[PDB]
């Protein structure tokens, strides 16, 4: 049996005060998101539901499309 999943990301803590330059928005009801689809094209929609347990969220799209998107395929539409 294997114990390690191979590939470690961020395993060190800060020793001195460090400011935040790249902020990351959160998943909430009424959040304009960009749901990336498997066709290579992006999708615009607002958050109708949130699943912070399985890292998922439901969003209502411009063309009345209610599609379930993952927090990894989502890009907050702000800038």
């Amino acid at each position: 049996s294997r114990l390690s999943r191979s590939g470690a990301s961020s395993l060190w803590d800060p020793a001195s005060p460090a400011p935040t330059s790249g902020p990351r928005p959160r998943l909430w009801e009424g959040q304009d998101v960009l749901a990336r689809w498997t066709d290579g094209l992006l999708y615009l929609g607002t958050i109708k539901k949130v699943d912070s347990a399985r890292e998922v969220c439901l969003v209502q799209f411009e063309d009345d499309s209610q599609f379930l998107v993952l927090w990894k395929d989502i890009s907050p539409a702000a800038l």
Binding site: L34, L41, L42, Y43, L44, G45, F61, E62, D63, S75, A77
Partner: peptide, 11 residues
Amino acid sequence: ATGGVKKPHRY
């Protein structure tokens, strides 16, 4: 070209 439904980053 489309322009009536979703309006994401560019497409």
